[PDB]
């Protein structure tokens, strides 16, 4: 069954999903603010995470104003960060909309399509696979590029099994 | 391919979609306000609409506070309104979330699933089929249950099917 779930996530906290996100599903983070002059991160200004049941970081999205780049990576909870993917020019990805922003993640099975507002920033080839069962938004009150509380909206149960009888 | 399009629809206006909404696609209307004391509609307080290229109301969602009901219907541009599907108790459908609201419509090909926030309020069997080429949000600042501007976000190019054959 297709469904919509809404989660208010405060900076520095995580949430367990009522319905997991799998291939064909969508997850969008909504920020009621956009602070592109928040100062240097430590090293990250803001991070958004998709966790698998086992605790693995399936997708780690990190924004760094001082390096002017958006990082995408994965890792096991007790392991080292894997191969970092980078996309430069943070402001250009949010260009067109001020005072708010949205980050959408499409789970395509083999890759994660990340879209900031209307722009696809990267087709991220997965380094770790599995179902997303938890989300987190990490940042300090002072240096986050997003609002203190971000709202995560998930669209699940989207893929359909179509049986054909001959 | 999959894409996100954002539209900011002021009350009483409509917008053409850059990417049409078809089977497997999703549209969510976001309101920064929830005015359950907006007063009397005439008879509608607010309407959210998915239009076909010929102007047909593929899906008409009308919120009525005084009649305490959310109506779902369809009709051709030059045709009469068809069979209404009703959901009583407007407030109850939005319960749990205050100061704002979210209305999502899934185009499942044969039906339209309408969800208010996290609550699926109806699996509306289509009365008219076709792709959605435009959307509208109609109301007056005076009696709308939503904010003056409603943000509509469409997720398109979504369709994902796994085919299974038997003989
Ligand atoms: C402090 C710092 O700049 N750490 C980043 C840096 O780490 C190198 C390898 C070294 N350990 C150090 O300088 O401390 O460079 C790596 C990439 O080579 C990485 O960006 C380090 O930041 C970490 O990045 C991961 C995601 O890849 C997470 O964002 C961590 O929170 C972050 O510390
Ligand atoms: C004016 C009005 O409230 N009309 C609604 C009412 O019509 C009855 C039959 C009668 N003509 C009248 O009281 O004026 O009841 C019908 C359903 O029986 C319907 O809700 C009428 O409202 C119309 O509903 C359609 C959707 O079905 C649209 O919302 C129209 O804008 C609206 O006028």
State the Cα–Cα distance between residues A30 and A153, nearest whole angstrom. Answer: 8
Method: X-ray
Give the residue from chain B lying closest to A154, CA to CA.
B118
Kindly state the DSSP code that residue B34 receives in the 8-state scheme: -
Pair type for strands A160-165 and B161-166: parallel
State the Cα–Cα distance between residues A7 and A30, nearest whole angstrom. Answer: 10
Domains detected in chain B? 1-167 (2.60.120.200)
Pair type for strands B69-75 and B3-10: unpaired
State the Cα–Cα distance between residues B56 and B70, nearest whole angstrom. Answer: 20
Closest by CA to A47, choosing from A17, A75, A79, A5, is A75
- Going by the annotation, the residues of the binding site of B are 44, 60, 64, 73, 75, 81, 84
How many contiguous H segments (helices) and E segments (strands) does chain B have? 1, 13
Q: Which two tokens stand for residue A59?
A: 């997708």
Resolution (Å) of this entry: 2.0
Give the residue from chain B lying closest to A8, CA to CA.
B97
Residue from B43, B74, B128, B139 whose mutation best tests the ligand 2 pocket (most atoms within 8 A of CB): B43
| Closest Cβ opposite residue B165 in set A4, A160, A164 | A164
Q: What is the DSSP string of A84-126?
A: -EEEE-HHHHHTT--S-EEEEEEE-SSEEEEEETTEEEEEEE-
Residue A6 sits at the chain B interface (C-beta within 8 Å): yes
Q: Which two tokens stand for residue B29?
A: 């209307």
């Amino acid at each position: 069954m297709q469904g919509v779930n809404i989660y208010n996530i405060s900076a520095g906290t995580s949430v367990d999903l009522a319905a997991p996100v799998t291939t064909g599903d969508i997850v969008t983070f909504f920020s009621s603010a956009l602070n592109l002059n928040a100062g240097a991160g430590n090293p990250n200004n803001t991070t958004l995470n998709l966790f698998a049941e086992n605790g693995a970081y399936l997708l780690h999205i990190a924004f760094r104003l001082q390096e002017n780049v958006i990082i995408f990576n994965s890792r096991q909870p007790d392991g080292p960060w894997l191969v970092e993917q980078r996309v430069s020019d943070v402001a250009n990805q949010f260009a067109g909309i001020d005072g708010k922003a949205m980050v959408t993640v499409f789970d395509h099975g083999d890759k994660y399509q990340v879209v900031i507002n209307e722009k696809t920033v990267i087709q991220y080839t997965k380094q770790i696979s599995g179902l997303t069962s938890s989300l987190s938004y990490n940042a300090t009150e002072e240096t986050s590029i997003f609002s203190t509380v971000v709202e995560a909206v998930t669209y699940t149960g989207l893929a359909l099994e179509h049986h054909h009888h001959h």
